[PDB]
Design a protein around this nucleic acid. Sequence first.
DNA 1: CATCTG
DNA 2: CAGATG
Length: 327
Amino acid sequence: ETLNGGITDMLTELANFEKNVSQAIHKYNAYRKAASVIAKYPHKIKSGAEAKKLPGVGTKIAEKIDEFLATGKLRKLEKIRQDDTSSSINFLTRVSGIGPSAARKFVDEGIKTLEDLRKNEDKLNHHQRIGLKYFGDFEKRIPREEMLQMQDIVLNEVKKVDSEYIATVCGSFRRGAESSGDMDVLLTHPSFTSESTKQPKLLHQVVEQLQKVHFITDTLSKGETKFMGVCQLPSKNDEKEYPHRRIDIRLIPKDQYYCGVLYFTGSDIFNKNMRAHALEKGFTINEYTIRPLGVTGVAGEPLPVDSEKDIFDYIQWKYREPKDRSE
DNA sequence: CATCTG
DNA sequence: CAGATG
Ligand code: NA
Ligand code: NA
């Protein structure tokens, strides 16, 4: 956790680059198990050979650990940090909509910067376009104080459109969090479930409403169950308008809301443990359901849930306020 | 995993 | 349809 930190860190830089700049999924994947295991390792790696001993730990990695241990630095790490091409890739990639893939294509064409991008607005698709237009807002965190105004709106409109709609704002926003990066709304309706064959309307009506009143600004992706947008809290009495915020809305069958809700609320760590405990308790849990574990190895059949409560109960645990869902 | 692009 | 992005 801090005893093999540098190592796990350098290793992470290295892994990343393979994947992002080169295409080295294998190598990349290589640096990764490596960093994971060294990360788990209980002592202070005092040398290459020492590490090598570990699984995932091969000869070049070892070599590398050696040089790093030997001197506070690594050549290759130094070479990669300079290289403009690599840097570009890391940069372009910050644009919502631009993945590494594309980052390569553009760089090869010479688009390496933000201006470059503007100039070549033709080469960008809609998503990327938006992404470019709100690069700044996009990277700005979302203060919970805004979150509340947001939440306040979305819920009011959802309500208007149907009394029967059930919306929830998952995310850290839900676990306490003083700020967040994006707005995540879980949605369901009684009239939509596991079997129930579809009802796209269910998701479309709301999106519509949201744009009606102007909260939703642009559409990133709009499917029959998952919508990806941009929204903005009305600029009051002109002098201070807000940044544009990423926002997502997803329809869920009513018969798997809470597991979802639970699920998305996090944290990853909370999940796991909960997940693990469920397991002891003779159960299973994933994004959509909780299932009674048979003995033949495994086995299923969806337990019936009406709240986050029903869930815990099953695994016979202490109902946790979302705040304390931390770890 | 769901949506998009091409 | 394969392949990309989130
Ligand atoms: Na990006
Ligand atoms: Na292939």
